[PDB]
Write a protein that binds this ligand. Structure first.
Ligand SMILES: O=C(NC1CC1)c1ccc2c(c1)OCO2
Ligand SMILES: [Zn+2]
Length: 140
């Protein structure tokens, strides 16, 4: 599990999105596994506007932050998880690391701030849903 809190906006994996998230929807995309919902109390995180391929992610199926090199956001054949079938996911940045289903929502961060959240995990690869192209989060 896990969310980003960029102001009064909560960023989560679309597949972990709660009834409250859907009842306070702002934007969602199934091909990315992203959804953003409105909050009443403000959060403590900032989004990265950059082309970094290095950072640190949180891996809940280990309780560790791991430093990683990660691939640029792309259309990636993911395969059967507990929460999706085998399929392509868009804007998925890839790194070599531990990612099980429940790791989803772990933050990937660089020197520029939050890069994205864990979305995918298979064959010793962790996949992150990029949020860097979503420029509209910082304002409004
Ligand atoms: O190891 C993977 N998981 C599923 C095969 C079981 C995996 C397969 C294809 C990918 C990928 C990850 O990231 C870029 O495209
Ligand atoms: Zn960066």
């Amino acid at each position: 599990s896990g969310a980003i809190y960029v102001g009064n906006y909560r960023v989560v994996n679309r597949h972990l999105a709660t009834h409250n998230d859907w009842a306070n929807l702002v934007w969602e995309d199934s091909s990315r596994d992203l959804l953003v919902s409105s909050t009443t109390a403000q959060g403590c995180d900032t989004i990265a506007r950059c082309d970094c391929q290095t950072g640190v992610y949180y891996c809940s199926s280990r309780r560790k932050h791991y430093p990683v090199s990660f691939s640029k956001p792309s259309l990636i054949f993911v395969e059967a998880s507990e929460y999706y079938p085998a399929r392509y996911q868009s804007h998925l940045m890839l790194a070599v690391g531990h990612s099980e289903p429940g790791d989803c929502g772990g933050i990937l961060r660089c020197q520029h701030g939050v890069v994205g959240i864990v979305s995918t995990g298979g064959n010793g690869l962790v996949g992150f849903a990029d949020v860097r192209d979503l420029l509209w989060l910082d304002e409004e």
